[PDB]
Amino acid sequence: KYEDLRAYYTKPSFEFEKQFGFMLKPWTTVRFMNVIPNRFIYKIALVGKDEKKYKDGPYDNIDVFIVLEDNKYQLKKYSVGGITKTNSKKVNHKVELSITKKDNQGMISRDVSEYMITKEEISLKELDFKLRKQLIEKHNLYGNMGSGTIVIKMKNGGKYTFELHKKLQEHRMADVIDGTNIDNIEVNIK
């Protein structure tokens, strides 16, 4: 049942900082930012709030969190969202990650760890992806259980919720938040 999710959220990810973003002739109706950290051009789709945010550029000093999408019908490999402004100063903002899990036998277990935030501005894409990957690896998410929530709890009381039974909505992969205003992170698997 959860094979597609497990496959997607165990893909490798790539992260680069202080990149030079540029725009080319568009090759679809969605616009893209391009970065070349090494010799491979990463193409990043501009969705959600990013469509308004970036016009022709170029855009220096951006960080990117990249996951290459499966699209059988596009030869170009691309990622979606995950663009942020690079740090102005170094950040080490340690937050509590609590994990409550009710397994297929209804047994409730509770665990805790700490999650190091290193970015002033961080995409929901990166938090969603890295957290689900950690959950798959350490708590067998998408093994027997594949529903519930990840909740990023902010210092003003606000919440960003990722529902585990489906992929993060595409537009939300462009949403960015203040990494240092993250109060804690709560996972509830069922």
Contact between 134 and Cl ion (CB under 5 A)? Answer: yes
x-marked contacts with Cl ion along 78-117 as a string, rule CB under 5 A: ----------------------------------------
Please tell me whether residue 29 binds Cl ion under the rule CB under 5 A.
no
Minimum distance from CB of 17 to Cl ion (Å)? 21
Complex with Cl ion: residue 41 or 154, whichever CB lies closer: 154
CA separation for the pair 189, 98 (Å, rounded):
11
Determine the Cα–Cα distance for residues 85 and 178; give it in Å rounded to an integer: 11
In this structure, the chain runs to a length of: 190
Which lies closer to Cl ion via its Cβ, residue 70 or residue 114?
A: 114
If one asks whether residue 184 binds Cl ion (CB under 5 A), the answer comes out as no
**By the rule CB under 5 A, 180 interacts with Cl ion:** no
Which region among 34-42, 62-70, 142-150, 174-182 touches Cl ion (by CB under 5 A)? 174-182
C-alpha span between 99 and 97 (Å, rounded):
7
Q: How far is the CB of 99 from Cl ion (least distance, A)?
A: 6
Query: What's the gap between Cα 155 and its chain centre?
Result: 20
The stretch among 39-47, 56-64, 100-108, 151-159 that binds Cl ion (CB under 5 A) is 151-159
Residues 6 or more apart whose Cβ sits within 8 Å of residue 17: 63, 86, 87
Give kind and range of the element (H or E) at residue 160.
strand 159-163
Query: How far is 170 from 67, CA to CA, in rounded Å?
Result: 13
By CB under 5 A, is residue 138 in contact with Cl ion?
Answer: yes
Contact 180/91 with Cβ under 8 angstroms? yes
Residues that bind Cl ion (CB under 5 A): 134, 138, 154-156, 175, 181
